[PDB]
Amino acid sequence: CKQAGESCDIFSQNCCVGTCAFICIE
């Protein structure tokens, strides 16, 4: 789980419920 703007990978998403293709928006 991560806040929108926090680091994130494509296959490895940091947003539990947020699209993280190339960025986390949760």
Judge residue 16's burial from the number of C-beta atoms within 10 Å of its C-beta, 0-12 exposed, 13-18 middle, 19 or more buried: exposed
- 22 DSSP assignment: S
Structure determined via: NMR
User: What is the DSSP code (8-state) at residue 21?
Assistant: S
Residues 6+ apart with CB under 8 A from 5: 23, 24, 25
